[PDB]
Structures are given as structure tokens and as C-alpha cells.
Paper text:
To obtain the donor substrate UDP-GlcNAc-bound structure, we mutated the catalytically important residue Glu495 to alanine, which allows the enzyme to trap the substrate in its substrate-binding site. The uridine moiety of UDP-GlcNAc is fixed within the tub of the reaction chamber, which consists of a loop region from Thr237 to Glu241 in the GT domain of the enzyme, through a series of interactions with the residues in this region. The GlcNAc moiety appears to be solvent-exposed and oriented away from the catalytic site. Superposition of UDP-GlcNAc-bound PsChs1 with apo-PsChs1 showed no significant local or global structural differences (root mean square deviation of 0.54 Å for 693 Cα atoms). An N-terminal sequence (residues 23–39), unresolved in the PsChs1 apo structure, appeared as an α-helix in the UDP-GlcNAc complex. This helix extends into the opposite protomer and interacts with the LG subdomain through hydrogen bonds. Structural comparison between the apo and UDP-GlcNAc-bound states revealed that residues Pro38, Leu39 and Pro40 are in different locations, indicating that the N-terminal extension of the SP subdomain in the UDP-GlcNAc-bound state adopts a different conformation. The Mn2+ ion in the UDP-GlcNAc-bound structure only forms charge interaction with the phosphate groups, with a bond distance of more than 3.5 Å, which is much weaker than a coordinate bond. The donor substrate-bound structure shows an additional N-terminal region from residues 23–39.
The core of the chitin biosynthetic machinery is an integral membrane enzyme named chitin synthase (CHS) (EC 2.4.1.16). The structures reveal the chitin synthesis reaction chamber that has the substrate-binding site, the catalytic centre and the entrance to the polymer-translocating channel that allows the product polymer to be discharged.
Author numbering:
A (entry chain A), B (entry chain B): 23 to 39, 49 to 741, 762 to 859
Write the structure that this text describes.
Amino acid sequence: HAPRSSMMSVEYDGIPLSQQYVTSYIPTGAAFPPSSVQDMISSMKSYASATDLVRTYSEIPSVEEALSTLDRAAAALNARRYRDALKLYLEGGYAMANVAERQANPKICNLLTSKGFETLNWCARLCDWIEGRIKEKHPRPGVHKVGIPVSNWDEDWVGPFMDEEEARRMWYTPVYCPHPIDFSNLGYRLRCVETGRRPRLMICITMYNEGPQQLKATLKKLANNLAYLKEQMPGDEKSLTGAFAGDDVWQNVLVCIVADGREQVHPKTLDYLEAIGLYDEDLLTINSAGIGAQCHLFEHTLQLSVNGKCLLPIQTVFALKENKASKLDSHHWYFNAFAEQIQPEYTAVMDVGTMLTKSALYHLLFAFERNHQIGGACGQLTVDNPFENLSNWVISAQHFEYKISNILDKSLESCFGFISVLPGAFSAYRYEAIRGAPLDAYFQTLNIELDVLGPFIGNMYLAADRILSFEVVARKNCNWTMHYVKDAVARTDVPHDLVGLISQRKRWLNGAFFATLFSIWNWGRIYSESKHTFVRKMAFLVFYVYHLLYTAFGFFLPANLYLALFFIVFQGFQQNRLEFIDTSEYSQTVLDCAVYIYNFSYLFGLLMLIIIGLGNNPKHMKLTYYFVGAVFGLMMMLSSLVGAGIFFSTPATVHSIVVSILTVGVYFIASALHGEVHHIFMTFTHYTALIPSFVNIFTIYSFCNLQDLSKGDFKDVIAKRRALEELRREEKERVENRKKNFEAFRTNVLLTWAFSNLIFALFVVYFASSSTYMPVLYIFVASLNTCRLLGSIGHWVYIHTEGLRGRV
Amino acid sequence: HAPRSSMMSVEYDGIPLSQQYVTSYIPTGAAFPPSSVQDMISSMKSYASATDLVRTYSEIPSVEEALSTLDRAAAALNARRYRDALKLYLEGGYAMANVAERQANPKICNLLTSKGFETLNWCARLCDWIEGRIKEKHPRPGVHKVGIPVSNWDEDWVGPFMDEEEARRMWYTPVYCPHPIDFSNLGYRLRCVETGRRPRLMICITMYNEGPQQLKATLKKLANNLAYLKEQMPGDEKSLTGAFAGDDVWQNVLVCIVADGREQVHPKTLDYLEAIGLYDEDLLTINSAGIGAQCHLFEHTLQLSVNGKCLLPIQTVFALKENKASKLDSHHWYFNAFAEQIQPEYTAVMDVGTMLTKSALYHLLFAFERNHQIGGACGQLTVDNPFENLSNWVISAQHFEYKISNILDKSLESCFGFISVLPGAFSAYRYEAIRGAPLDAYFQTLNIELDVLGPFIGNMYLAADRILSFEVVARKNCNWTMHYVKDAVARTDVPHDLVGLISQRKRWLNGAFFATLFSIWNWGRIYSESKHTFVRKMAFLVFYVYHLLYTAFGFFLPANLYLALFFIVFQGFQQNRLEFIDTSEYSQTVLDCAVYIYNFSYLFGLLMLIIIGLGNNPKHMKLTYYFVGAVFGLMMMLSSLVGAGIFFSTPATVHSIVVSILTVGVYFIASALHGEVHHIFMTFTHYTALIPSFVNIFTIYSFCNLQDLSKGDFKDVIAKRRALEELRREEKERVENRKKNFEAFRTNVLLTWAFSNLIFALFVVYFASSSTYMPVLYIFVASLNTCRLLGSIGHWVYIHTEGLRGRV
Ligand SMILES: CC(=O)N[C@H]1[C@@H](OP(=O)(O)OP(=O)(O)OC[C@H]2O[C@@H](n3ccc(=O)[nH]c3=O)[C@H](O)[C@@H]2O)O[C@H](CO)[C@@H](O)[C@@H]1O
Ligand SMILES: CC(=O)N[C@H]1[C@@H](OP(=O)(O)OP(=O)(O)OC[C@H]2O[C@@H](n3ccc(=O)[nH]c3=O)[C@H](O)[C@@H]2O)O[C@H](CO)[C@@H](O)[C@@H]1O
Ligand SMILES: [Mn+2]
Ligand SMILES: [Mn+2]
């Protein structure tokens, strides 16, 4: 018992030595007499020293404290606590006014002084509002924009004419507008509106987490397009006339760069923007202290110089949003605020890094002006430098896919005047067919939270460009059609690895599938509500039948691929149907061995792909995806060689040659007709080596991630705490419910798809022979490719004929 | 062009009327003359009105503002900004001193006055520390505990003897100790230490999100156990002697209730705690304003009354933690702080809701005192009210599982003196074998973040009780063994649904599997480091061989179950091996039909289970899990009936009857030997109907979730913003890396397990017959069950013999 007593004695000796430890008993109900308390308070003199120290310390303010007080004032005004907001605003204004004297930098001194004066005036206005002498709804500090000289200006530059105010001053203003519809009601204006200019074309360049090189290339290409438009010959049949003429075209084009979040912008991108006079950190930090702005917009008529050539000036508005949001939110801000204020004629949308050729804008504007029935158009999407880096299989496969998709599908859809725009493409509309209901349908997701809509609507709007296209075509009391321009070439930079391709295709496939389902369900609105010609309605009905058949065939693609490969190759080897060899006798331990190996490999690969895709992100699993892709590619190459041998050994019956043409040679026929044939010759092998990887891997990973979507008393204090707890718990419960619904939806869809494919494959393998199934598949494929070839030929005839027959 | 001009004119007319909109140009480099600025400032008189309004408003302080200022002061002191902390503390102290006068409630007035005086004294001490007259390391406000009378006290109560201070006053103190090891260094003490009492037994009741009923039942059962210990007859061979005698036992027991988070405690639980005098919201809110405490502890010697019986007083310490953490954190606080201070002899751990019988503590203490080689013990775990609600299959299955596991496995492991404790059980240790290294191994997860350790260590410590048990057994330079007490019955409340059972078993299975792997790898430490008897080392080696074989068999359990069912039932039906019927001829379209149906159903069920488990949480998917479980249960019941028919039709050879006994009848033999036989008769059918559901569903869901684990200038402001951005980005990157590693680990483990099972099943089906595989399985199962039966019989002999042979 010695150690216990020793440790207790040690604790007791450590007890001695607001001291370290005080034990007190508070008696309730006595409430104390107000005689000893006063003397006890007056009996302590260290309070005088503490007060002296605090008073001495609090004499000199600082910039950081002033900014923090202004931030707290902004929060308090957001919570509608006007007394505290007024007090904190007064404190911050006085602090900044005092601080501005000490700063050595003249720019900082001027900015601080101006901000202090603005804050004091706002305090006066808020005091007047509190008094009730001035009555207003939801007061806010007055809008104030600051123009400052650009830090770096090029002495040697050539231009048509530039006022010094426009040339050297960059303007800035932070905005609070929570609903971008009310942008022009709150008093915000742009430099173009102030100066009297009325641009007719607007371009939006969405940006998020990008290097300087992509933005620089995009701006250089846009400047080249403007230069080409300027040098357009006058008084010519092909030339454009009107606002887009020469020597004044640069005044009719405005470029909006809408960043997605100040916390995610690449620092080098910010440095490059500051170089061209479109960003300044000190101005943003000082002038946005008290406003609590949603986004800050800079304005400048930038001049760019490349080597010895001076590009034309570009009117640019850079809107940087404080918090991260979706790209649809950037389009919300752009469309609503800037289109409603400026009221343009055409509205073009592109991403960052899209490098246009010198004639893209000319062709788009020419189509829009000549046709006058076009409510929307989309240009051709291409891969930058396809011939270079030809050793990479992914790049060549993507190049072949882009070319074939553009030619066949875009031409066929554009013949009927209804286009499903590829995501990431460079598109354009006119701000007369998207004025009302189409934009409401576009932004319904932002207007209403996902909980009310559900998972189907969120997945549908994951790619909402097709929604806008359909709303344009099927608009009530209007007949707007779409068009595809072959000469508006825009070159992007596709991913060089399988994993980035997997993620990109995941987003693409989810959006496309659910947009297609929405279009199929709502196709009736074209007849019920729109007012087209009868011929147009009949053509739409024909295209609807074709669309139904094509989608139904596409849904059962993995099963058909497996059945075709299995039947042809492996039951030609096992049952001696390969025409260039006789496998009749053999060991008989090899005839079944090939089929067993093929079935086991296919099933194990599919199981592994499903397990990986439903689980970990496709970034750690690079090796496994590469291995599965390599196995499938080798299998497909072997199948292609065997099929070629079988075809060449056949005596080439008329039916065989006709089916071969209408099945495979449609690609080469269309490519030769449109003149883009060498790309097909170069990339056909690379695409063939990746067909099964495309189908299986991309569809499985896309379907496995359908849920991935974006002066009170004490009792007053107690009630406030309880209310906060209740709100927190209800918010957590709502989030859990949303997650539950999305997960259930994605699981149901994946199970339906996978089990439908498995049941189809089993019931065809067990109950059907190769002689009773392959002719049906050949007929189906030949029909689809014949329709696509007819559409492509029709588009070529239209593009080479309508110019002559424009009179009729 | 009329609408455009009209809208521009509308905007211009809306322009007119800190006003609504001001456009200014700030010239940089001028810096202004200090002549006009002073006159301009003095030219505005509304500032006088604003100052008067602010001065008038700021006269009267409030409770909420004082508490907010104290919170800000606590944050500033946490950031080591002593000037601002001192200023805010002074402001809060003065505000509370002024506020205390106005309050009508005497208790609130007294608490506010005392807190204000304490805050002022702390301000004086901090000012002295800033001056440097007093030099100290990391200053903090002095520890101050408040004792207040209990709101509700029972006038009619019977007890041995209670001082009025102990009977009527409840004590409270908030603690700041960040590392619980330094609890006694900072000056914190408990009431037992102050009063001079030295308890010898401590009990910890971990609580999180529980209703009042469970806590009330646990406290009533503990009081009953204390009453039984008190009434123990003196001067008897069986009776305990020493500190645990009668009439003073209640002074030697302390109960620690460690809540997990103030934001998650059920409000009714807080109300019940306040009823028995263990919680008060006003005291917590007032006295914890400035300290910024990590957890707040209340102390009381509670008296409980049930109906007409008055239970014995219980010394209770309720420690409520501010933020949520793991249960291991609660054990960290309990063990380190309270054990290191009190220095007890025994330390018992239980959950909340565990209802003990009247003799559990007596049996545990008797074993600990008599054996003296026991470093740890665990009691029997049972299901409350098993016979009632017998219609529910899940409850009966769990009852059978608990009984069989306890008897067979616990007896076999306890014979060798090494036990793997069931999670959630009621266990005990002595605070002499866990003093040093075992607790360090226990808390290594809390000491080091998971990023350094990895996923294996986190999954291992998900159930870290087995780690503590192994460290106790294999402690260096000591020979501590464990023991299992059959008579320490603790009854829990098992879940009534399949989904809660699924989640609970997920946690159990992950912890058990990885703890078993750790034990297998580190078994060598018993021979290399520990100092046991040679006989003990040989017994440990034998048990190690048995453990290896048992774990290896358990890993391949689903494949063996599938093979046994398929072979016996379905290749007895197809190949005419069912002895009670002749299926030789038949349609021949049915002989293969049964096998095809069985294979397809099994494969589809497994695929659906994997897809669901890897995806959505098992709460929305109740119907699918129920359907799969029902299908598997019907299949298992049919297989059981067919097997019984086959066995009874056989002429009962000697080998057959011996294998049948040593395979199945071991359960009934052991149950009859230990006297718990009727439960087996009642629940055998219910457990048989859920064997396959257990195996497949629980193992798959457990393996699919291995990743689920818990005065500067402007340039100074710019640098601070940049530093904050860098820290935020690095934190996000680190979190992403951790998620990547955990997901990769879980995917690799799941793939290994599933593919090993599939390959084993395929290579046994294709290359082995029923006559060359079933005898091996029978031999393996018979060997395992024979070893388990021998262990159970040995434990029974020891428990009924060692009492006589205690002399030798
Ligand atoms: C979905 C996906 O994996 N896309 C990848 C794809 O870009 P990918 O071309 O597929 O698509 P993006 O998502 O990058 O394009 C959407 C457009 O909106 C912008 N945007 C993007 C995200 C956002 O939250 N808000 C926003 O406004 C983008 O900058 C772009 O202008 O290849 C890039 C490399 O070549 C990768 O870096 C991208 O991760
Ligand atoms: C993991 C799981 O799904 N367990 C469920 C199981 O309890 P189950 O008995 O399986 O296990 P618990 O996780 O509830 O038990 C852990 C012990 O520590 C406490 N604890 C719990 C969580 C925590 O974050 N910190 C903490 O300290 C618990 O109160 C308990 O005393 O059946 C209960 C209903 O009968 C459910 O409500 C639980 O959700
Ligand atoms: Mn891009
Ligand atoms: Mn529980």
C-alpha cells in the first residue's frame, strides 16, 4: 500500500498554487447585498493597470483590423442587424481613414482614402434609413466603380483610334446582385453602355483552373478572326454587309471571360491577366471590403501584340466569381445580366482553349444572315495536331471518332434541322429565339433545388445544351430550326491518357443519354405547340422513327458486340466455319478450349470493370484499366484479322458484297465525298483497336456514377441555441435523404441495364444459332448505315446546291 | 430599331438617383494635399448624429454580447494574440459585471457576478504575465470549479450516511487539457480525491445518442450489483474479503459516464440527467464562456429510488465532451486522466444498456482475487428476453449465435489463457497489467494520424480491444493471462431488423479480421519477449496451429458452402444420388434444369449483393436485402430437409454415424454439458434458416467498406491571404491522397477475396467429383468440431475441479 499512499501524498503536495485551482460553492437564492460588491470591486487596483495597457495598445489601428471589422459589418448587414452593422461600418471607415495617412505607396493611400470616404457616406445613408426620414426596401451600400491606369502599357502599338481614357484606364466594380436578372435594376452598367457603343455580337469564354497558354491561344485566335472580318472585301456577293463590315468590326464584338472561382484560378493565369491589364489584387482587396460582393468585374479594351504583329483591340469584360459554382451558373450570369443589358443580336458560346480558324466567325455570321430561319448553329470540332504524335493510339482514336461523328451524325441531323450539340463545342445562337421560355428551361436546375426535381432531372441537366436546342426547335408559336456549318473549324486539346478520357466520356454519356430520353418523351410538343410547315412535321416524324430505332440499337450494343465476336470467330473455329482453314478434327481439347477461354476472360473482365468503376476513382487504377483495355484491343484485332480472312476466302456473292459495302464502306464513301479521307486511312486501325474498350469501359463507368451530382436575456440565448441545433439537424437529415434518393436511382438504372444485356445475351446464345441470328444483325446494321449515308449525301447536296437555288 | 432605342432611353431615365450610383476616377501618384481633406471632413455634420446614435445605443450591454466577446477572446488566446485577448476579456468581464445587476433570477445573478470577478482576476494575471513581472509557460485562466445545490432532492430517502455537502451539492468544472495525460499536472482534481476517499474499482459507461431508458436500466442494475456485494455474508470461504466487504462497498466504486458529443446527446437523456442532479444548462453556459473547454465534468453522489425500494448511493462523474470523437477517444480520456489520478486496482468497461445480473461483479472480483495470474477477464454476453418475441427470426438467430460462440469458442480460447473479446461485451482488467506499453499500443491510433499509419492499421484498430488483449498476454518481462467467467451474465438489446444487423456485423467483421491478421503476424513476441512457463509456450504453439487452420478454413467459407450444397443436393437429384427416390429416367429436361436454375440464381444473387453493398447504404435497400435473404433461407431449408432424408435413408454405417456426431451433435453435447440446452432446441431452426445469409451478405458488405474510417501593413495582409490559400490547398491535397490510398486498399482486398473464392469454386467443380471432395470436407469439419468440443469439456472440468485442487 506504500505506492498508493506515496502517489496520494505527491498529489497533495502538488495541490498548492486567478490561481491554479479554486473550489467554490455558489449559494442560489441569496442574490447578495449591494454593499460589499462595490467595495470589493473598488478594492482591486490591477484593473487600472489593465485598462491603461488596453488604452495604450488600442491607440494605433491597422489595415487588417479595419478589413476584419468591415467583413463583420458585411456579415451583420447580411443578417439584417442594422445597429451593429452601422457601428462596425463607422469603426471600419474611421480606421481606414486613419490608416491611409501612414501608407507610403501613393496608390494604396488613394484607395484607402476613397474607400474610407465611401464608407462614411454609406454610414450616413444607413443612419438616415434607420431614422425613417428616408424609406427604402432592403438598403445596400451604393454602387461605386473605380478606374485606374494600367500598370504596364505598350508604348509601341498600332490601332485605328483609341481615346486615352479607354486605352490606358482599366475599370473595376464589385457587384452584389444575388439574382442576375436584377443586374440592370440595381444600377450596374458596363463601359460599352456608358460610352454609347452597342455591340451586336457577344462571346463567352468560360474558365476554371486553366493555364495561361490556353487563354493566350484563345485570345490570339479571336483577334485573328476579328482581323479577317475587318479585311473583308466590300461590295461583294459573298461578303457580309451591315454592322459586321470592315474598319469598325472590333467595336461590335464584346468578349466576356467568366471565371468560376477565385480560390481555384491558377496563379499563373492571374499573373497573365494582370500583365494584359485585366486584374489587380490590391484594388480587389481594398474596394470589396465592406460590400460582400458576389462577383467582381473588370473591364478593359485590351491590346495584344504577338511577335512583330499587333492584333486588333478586343473589348473584354472579366467577371470573377467569389464562390465556386457550375458552368451553368456562369452561363446564367452571362446570359441574364449581360444579354439583358446589352441586348445583342447573336450570342456565341465556347470554352477556353478552343482555337478557331481564320474563317469560323465569317461562316457562322454568313449562315445566320443568309438563312434567317436558323435559331442556332454549331461548328466543327477537331483535334489539334492529329498527324503529329501519331504513335499515341488514344489521340488517333479520338480524331477518328470526332471526324466520323461530325460527318455522319451532324450531316444527317442537320438535314432535318434538329441537332444534338456535342458537349464542349463552339456554338452560337441569336438572342431572339432564346429570349424567353428556352432560357427558363435551361436554368430550371439553378432556379429549383435538386430535392424537388429528383435525380432524373439533375442527370438530364448535367448536359443541358441539348435541352436548349430542343426548346429552340420546339418553341411555342415560333418555327426555329438549327444548322451545322462544316467550315467553322474549332480545334481543341483532347486528353492523352485513358483515365481522363474515361472521366470526360462519363460526363458526356450521362448527359447525352438522359437528354435523349427527355427528347423522346417530349417530342410531341413540336406538333402540339410549335407552328412549323407540314413538310417539316413529316420530316420530324421520320427522324423520330429513326431516332427511336438508333437509340434502341445503341442500348443493346455490348450484348451485340459479344454475340457477333463469339459467333463469328469462336464458333467458326470450334465448328469449322473459318473458310481459310479446316479445324474439323484437331485434338478436340482445343475446340472447346477457345470458347471456354473467351467466355471466362470476357466475364472476368466485365466483373472486374464493374467492381472498379462502382468503387474507386479511375486515377489510382491506371494499370488495371490499361491491362483490360490492352486485352480487349488484342481480342478485337484478332477478330478483325479473322473476319478479313473469312471475307476474302468467300467467293464474294452479290449479297455478301452489298452487305460489306453498306456496312463498312460507308465510312470511306462519306469521307471521300467530303474530302476528309486521309484522316480515316491514318486512324482506322487505332479506332478499331479501341472499339470494345470504348463500348464496355465507357458505358459501365458512366452508368456506375449517376448519383455524382453537385439585446436578449438568457432565455433568448437558450432559445437561439435550440433553434440553431434544430436547423443543423434538419439540414443533415435533408442531405441524407437526397443522397439516399440519388443512390437508389443510380443502382436501379445500373441493374436494369446490366441484367437486360445479360438476359438478352443468354437467351440468344442458348436458343439461337449463328445461321438464324447473323442475317438479322447484318440487316439492322446495313439499314442504319444506309440511312446515315443518305443523310450525309443529302447534306452535301444542300451545301453545294442551295447557293444556286436561293431564288426559289 | 425602335425597341432598342426605347430600352436605352428607359435605362437612361432610370439612371438618375452615398447615392445609388457614383462613377469616379482615382488618380495614382498625386497623393492629395493635406489642406482640403481636413475641411472636407469638417464640412459634414451627419457624422455628429451618427456618433450620438452609436453612443446612445452602446450604453446598455447585454448577456449575448458579453458571451460573444468572451468567445472571441478565447479564440484569440487560442491563437496566441495576447493583447487582443486581454482587451476582449476585460470587455467581457465588465459587461458581465454590469449585466449581473439587472437579472431577476438570483442564481443567474450569482453566477454572472462570480464569472465576472473570475474574468477580472484572470485579466489582472494576464496583464502581469505580459509585463514580464511573472514568467510562465503557456498561460491559461485559472481552474475554478463551482458546487451548486441540486434543483430536485428527495426528502424521503434511506442511506448509510451522507454529509450534507456531498448529499445536496453537485460539483462542476470545465477542463482545457488537450492531452489527457497532463490532466493531473494542470491542477484538476475530483471530489473523491479531495474528500480523501480512494476507490478501488472503476466502471466506464460510454454513451452516444441513447434514450433515457437504457441509461436508467444500466444504473439500476449497477445499484443492484452494489447491493448484492454489500449483503455478502462475512467470514465465509466463498465471500470476498478486503476493500469489497459490506457496509462500505459503495465508497470503493466510482462510475464514469463519458458522453461523446454535446451536439448529439438525446434531449430526453439530458433531461433525465438533470432530473437526477447531474446536468444544468445555465451553469454550463455561464461558467464555460471564456475558458474554451475541451470537456465539462459534473460530479455527484447520486441516490436513485425505484418504486418503494431505495438503491444504494453511487459516486458518479459525468464527463461531456464538446466535440464528437471516437469511442476510443472516450477510453483515452477515461483511462489516462481518471486512472492516472485515482490509481485504482481494477478497471471495468461496458457500454450503455448492458444490464448485468445480481452476481456479475461478485464473480469477476472473485476470479481476479483468487487467481492472481489474470490480467483481464470477460463475462458472458446474452440477448435480453430471448423466449419472448420468438416469432422474430433475427432475434432467435442472434441468440443461438451468441450462445454457441460463448460456449465453444470462449471455452476453447480460455483453456489456453488467451481470449479474443467480443465487441460490445462487458470486460474488466486490473490497472497493473495495462499500466504502460499495452495502453500505448491501444492509443497509437489517436497519437498518430492515419496518413502515416495507413489503411491496414486503421482497419486493425477499428476494433482495438483485441489489440489490448494481445498486448496484455504478450507483455514484456511479465506473464499475464486472460480468463472467461461463465456466470457474469450481461444482457444487451440486439437489433430487430436485418439492416442494423448488417451494419453492426460489418464493423465486427472488419475489426475481427484485421485483429486476427495482426495477432497471426505478431504471435512470435510471446516467445521472443514475454516470460511464460515452458508448458504455457507449448500450449500457445498448439493454439497457434489451431488458429491458423481455423482462420484458413473461415476464409474459404462461401465457396465451401456453395460446393457442399451443389454437390449433395443438386448432383444427388441430377445424377440419382438421393437415396429416398429414384430420379434416373425423368424428362431429362428437369435433371439439368435444377442445376442450371441453382447456378443462375446463386450467381445473380451474389452479383446483386456486391453491386448493392459497394454502392448505396443498406437502409434504402431494405426490400432487396430481405428478398435475397428469403431466397437463400428457403434454399437452405430445402437443402436441410434433403440432407436429413438422405441421412435417414442410409443404413447408418459406423463411419457415417461417427461423422454425423462429430459434425452436428457437438452443439447439443456441449449445450447439454453446460446446461444451456433449451435455447438451442428453440433457436436451431432459426439459425439454420439464416446461415447462408450470414456468410454471404455479412462478409460481402463487410469487405466492400474497408475505406470507411474516421499591426501589419497592406503587404502583411496580402501575405496572410496567400498563406491561408496555400494551407487550404495543401489540406485538400492531403485529404484527397488519404482517400485515394484507402479506396485502393479496400478494392485490392475485395478483389483478392472474391477472385480467390471464385477460382477455388471453379477448379473444384470442373476437376473434382463428389466422391473425391466430400470426404475431405467431412474430415476437416469433424477435426475442427472435435477440437472445439475438447476445449469446451476441458473448460468445464477446470471450472468444476480447480476449486478442489487449489492447494496444488
Ligand atoms: C469533366 C472532366 O474531367 N473534364 C476534363 C477534360 O475537360 P473537359 O473538356 O472534358 O470538360 P470541362 O469540365 O473542363 O469543361 C467545362 C467548361 O466549363 C469550365 N468549368 C469546368 C469545371 C467547373 O466546375 N466549372 C467550369 O466553368 C471549364 O473550364 C470548361 O471551359 O479534360 C481536361 C484536360 O484536357 C481536364 O482537366 C478536365 O478535368
Ligand atoms: C455501428 C452501428 O451501426 N451500431 C448500431 C448498434 O449499436 P452497436 O452495439 O452495434 O454499437 P455502437 O457503435 O452503438 O457501440 C459503441 C459504444 O460506444 C458508443 N459510441 C458510439 C458511436 C460513437 O461515435 N461513439 C461512441 O462512443 C455507443 O453508445 C456504445 O456505447 O445497434 C444500435 C441499435 O441497437 C444502433 O443504434 C447502432 O447504430
Ligand atoms: Mn478544356
Ligand atoms: Mn447499444
